[PDB]
Design a protein around this motif. Structure first.
Motif, short mmCIF file in Angstrom:
data_model
loop_
_atom_site.label_atom_id
_atom_site.label_comp_id
_atom_site.label_asym_id
_atom_site.label_seq_id
_atom_site.Cartn_x
_atom_site.Cartn_y
_atom_site.Cartn_z
N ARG A 1 37.29 39.19 43.60
CA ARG A 1 37.71 40.53 43.99
C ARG A 1 36.70 41.62 43.62
NH1 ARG A 1 43.11 43.79 41.93
NH2 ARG A 1 42.36 45.83 42.66
N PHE A 2 36.29 41.69 42.35
CA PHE A 2 35.43 42.76 41.88
C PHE A 2 33.96 42.52 42.11
CE2 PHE A 2 39.34 43.33 39.26
CZ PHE A 2 39.72 44.53 39.79
N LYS A 3 33.48 41.29 41.90
CA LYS A 3 32.07 40.97 42.06
C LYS A 3 31.70 40.55 43.48
CE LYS A 3 31.78 41.39 37.41
NZ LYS A 3 30.97 40.34 36.69
N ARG A 4 32.55 39.78 44.18
CA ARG A 4 32.23 39.35 45.54
C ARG A 4 32.89 40.22 46.64
NH1 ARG A 4 27.43 36.49 45.81
NH2 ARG A 4 27.60 34.44 44.83
N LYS A 5 33.73 41.20 46.23
CA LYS A 5 34.46 42.13 47.09
C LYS A 5 35.38 41.43 48.07
CE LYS A 5 32.22 45.54 45.02
NZ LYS A 5 31.15 44.85 44.25
N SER A 6 36.00 40.35 47.64
CA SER A 6 36.89 39.56 48.47
C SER A 6 38.24 40.24 48.69
CB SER A 6 37.09 38.19 47.86
OG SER A 6 38.14 37.47 48.47
N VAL A 7 38.64 40.42 49.97
CA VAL A 7 39.93 41.02 50.26
C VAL A 7 41.04 39.99 50.05
CG1 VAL A 7 38.77 42.63 51.89
CG2 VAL A 7 40.28 40.85 52.81
N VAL A 8 40.80 38.69 50.29
CA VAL A 8 41.83 37.68 50.05
C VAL A 8 42.08 37.47 48.55
CG1 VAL A 8 40.53 35.51 50.19
CG2 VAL A 8 42.98 35.56 50.74
N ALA A 9 41.04 37.57 47.69
CA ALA A 9 41.25 37.45 46.24
C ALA A 9 42.15 38.59 45.74
CB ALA A 9 39.92 37.46 45.51
N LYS A 10 41.94 39.83 46.26
CA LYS A 10 42.77 40.99 45.93
C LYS A 10 44.23 40.78 46.40
CE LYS A 10 43.03 45.93 46.16
NZ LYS A 10 42.70 47.23 46.83
N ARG A 11 44.41 40.28 47.63
CA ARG A 11 45.73 39.99 48.20
C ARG A 11 46.43 38.92 47.33
NH1 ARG A 11 45.20 39.01 54.71
NH2 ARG A 11 47.37 38.40 54.31
N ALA A 12 45.68 37.90 46.90
CA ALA A 12 46.20 36.83 46.04
C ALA A 12 46.67 37.37 44.66
CB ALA A 12 45.15 35.75 45.86
N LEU A 13 45.90 38.28 44.03
CA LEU A 13 46.21 38.90 42.75
C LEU A 13 47.41 39.82 42.85
CD1 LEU A 13 42.55 39.60 41.71
CD2 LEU A 13 44.20 38.16 40.40
N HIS A 14 47.50 40.60 43.93
CA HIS A 14 48.66 41.45 44.17
C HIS A 14 49.90 40.59 44.37
CE1 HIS A 14 46.38 45.25 45.69
NE2 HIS A 14 46.37 45.18 44.36
N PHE A 15 49.78 39.50 45.12
CA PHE A 15 50.90 38.60 45.36
C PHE A 15 51.38 37.94 44.05
CE2 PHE A 15 51.82 34.02 46.01
CZ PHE A 15 53.01 34.07 46.69
N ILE A 16 50.44 37.40 43.24
CA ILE A 16 50.75 36.77 41.95
C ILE A 16 51.42 37.77 40.99
CG2 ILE A 16 49.53 35.91 39.83
CD1 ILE A 16 47.48 34.65 41.89
N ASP A 17 50.98 39.03 41.02
CA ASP A 17 51.54 40.06 40.15
C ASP A 17 52.99 40.42 40.48
OD1 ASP A 17 51.23 41.94 37.92
OD2 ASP A 17 51.46 43.48 39.52
N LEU A 18 53.36 40.31 41.74
CA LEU A 18 54.69 40.65 42.20
C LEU A 18 55.65 39.48 42.16
CD1 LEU A 18 54.55 42.78 45.39
CD2 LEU A 18 56.03 43.09 43.41
N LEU A 19 55.13 38.28 42.41
CA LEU A 19 55.89 37.06 42.50
C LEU A 19 56.84 36.78 41.36
CD1 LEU A 19 56.47 34.79 44.40
CD2 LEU A 19 54.57 33.55 43.38
N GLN A 20 58.11 36.64 41.75
CA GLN A 20 59.26 36.33 40.92
C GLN A 20 59.75 34.93 41.30
OE1 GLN A 20 61.78 38.89 38.68
NE2 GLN A 20 62.20 39.90 40.65
N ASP A 21 60.28 34.18 40.32
CA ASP A 21 60.74 32.82 40.57
C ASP A 21 61.82 32.69 41.65
OD1 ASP A 21 58.98 32.23 38.50
OD2 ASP A 21 60.48 31.25 37.21
#
Length: 190
Positions: free
Chosen positions: A50-70
């Motif tokens: 996300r920060f070093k390679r500027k990946s939009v999917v890595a950012k989407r993955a981190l936002h998803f993991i942060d919100l994800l509830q069981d």
């Protein structure tokens, strides 16, 4: 009887198979339980992408993991960052030396990048260190797949994890395009 899948999910499985994982996270099956373990490597490597390679999917993955509830079936577990530090590298290296007929040299072990050493320690911790059995690494990265074979860590790909989940609900031995979550794309045998 009730099946239970224990997956250690890589950073590249999120980057290439976010759509697949998002579909697993909503499964409501009483006779299926997916325990998704995210080692320190997964979060750190997505952060790097996300920060070093500027990946939009890595950012989407981190936002998803942060919100994800069981879910009823999907259980997320993030590895505690300091827990990785308490796992012994000397014990992790035994898996590469001892039972592995095809091994790496003392120098080949020392040159393995720091991030992959952290991932290997989490894999040793869940797979070899002694319900919570049959831990399998879910990966889409070839440099990870080679190391997993060397260190006797069982691994599968996202499409393989998908067909396993699909059976439990098999044997394998352009704005609109950017908007949809990436989906993993090999072939399985029955």
């Amino acid at each position: 009887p009730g099946s239970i899948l224990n997956f250690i999910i890589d950073s590249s499985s999120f980057e290439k198979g976010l759509g697949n994982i998002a579909i697993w996270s909503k499964l409501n099956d009483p006779k299926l339980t997916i325990n998704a373990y995210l080692p320190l490597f997964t979060i750190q490597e997505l952060d790097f992408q996300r920060f070093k390679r500027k990946s939009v999917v890595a950012k989407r993955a981190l936002h998803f993991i942060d919100l994800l509830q069981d879910s009823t079936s999907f259980k997320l577990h993030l590895e505690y960052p300091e827990l990785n530090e308490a796992i012994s590298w000397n014990e992790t290296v035994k898996l590469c030396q001892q039972n592995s007929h095809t091994s790496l040299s003392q120098h080949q072990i020392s040159v393995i990048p720091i991030r992959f050493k952290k991932l290997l320690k989490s894999c040793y911790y869940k797979c070899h260190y002694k319900d919570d059995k049959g831990w399998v690494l879910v990966t889409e990265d070839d440099t990870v797949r080679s190391l997993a074979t060397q260190f006797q860590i069982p691994f599968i790909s996202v499409v393989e994890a998908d067909a396993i989940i699909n059976a439990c609900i098999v044997v394998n031995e352009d704005f609109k395009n950017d908007f949809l979550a990436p989906r993993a794309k090999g072939e399985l045998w029955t």
